[PDB]
Amino acid sequence: LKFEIPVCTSCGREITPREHATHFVCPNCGEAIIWRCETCRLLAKPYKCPKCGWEGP
């Protein structure tokens, strides 16, 4: 079996091997994992939790 590639929560694109991305548990509920790619972090794009709906950087 192969492995899965992480996907940005905001834009839905894949994470390249050596970019300045980040990931962390949801601040509000702590049940889901948020991924942010370098471009989304640079431009301050908002993100939304898939479980509780809390949103925003």
Binding site: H20, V25, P27, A44
Partner: protein, 196 residues
């Protein structure tokens, strides 16, 4: 309802902004006064403080880093690190602290707290390179670039910084279960602020 009464917020000067604004900060701006000075919304600050208190309680206590170059913020971060057990670096941030393993005080945290993105630019720049979440206190002048969780407040006043760090420490202690109620935290706010 609120962590503290709004009168205390207004007395500490949390809502006072600066003469300049930024496009991405307008989600927090309440209004602009006749002298060209911008005002922050305090309810947003309370909600973000509650969320940040919930978020920071899940990390290992000694893997948290708080920094403050500004003079008025050095005492609050020191007291905050003393109370919660997190590491604190007041004053100049030595370059290479997080990227140079040969430095004597090399250290890699899991999450960082930035008092002011403009003043603490070196620490933020090094934090970007190691891929950790960033929590910052932002004023009407700052940009939200590379900020993963934002807390809108005045980050230049003395009483404002003291109150913010006092509230955050109490929230972390309450969320991780070391105090059974909000009232048990018997430490005066005046103990966090720089004197004279």
């Amino acid at each position: 309802e609120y962590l503290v009464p709004l009168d205390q917020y207004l007395a500490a000067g949390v809502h006072i902004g600066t003469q300049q604004k930024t496009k991405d900060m307008k989600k927090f701006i309440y209004r602009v006064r006749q002298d060209g000075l911008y005002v922050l919304d305090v309810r947003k600050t309370d909600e973000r403080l509650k969320v940040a208190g919930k978020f920071l309680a899940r990390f290992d206590p000694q893997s948290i880093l708080a920094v403050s170059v500004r003079l008025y913020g050095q005492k609050p971060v020191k007291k905050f690190g003393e109370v919660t057990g997190a590491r604190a670096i007041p004053g100049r941030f030595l370059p290479g602290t997080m990227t140079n393993p040969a430095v004597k005080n090399f250290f890699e945290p899991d999450v960082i707290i930035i008092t002011d993105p403009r003043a603490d630019h070196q620490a933020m720049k090094e934090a970007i390179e190691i891929g950790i979440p960033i929590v910052a206190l932002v004023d009407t002048e700052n940009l939200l670039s590379y900020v993963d969780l934002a807390i809108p407040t005045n980050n230049k006043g003395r009483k404002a910084l003291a109150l913010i760090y006092w509230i955050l420490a109490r929230e972390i202690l309450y969320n991780r279960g070391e105090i059974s109620s909000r009232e048990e935290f018997k430490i005066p706010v005046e103990e966090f602020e720089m004197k004279i």
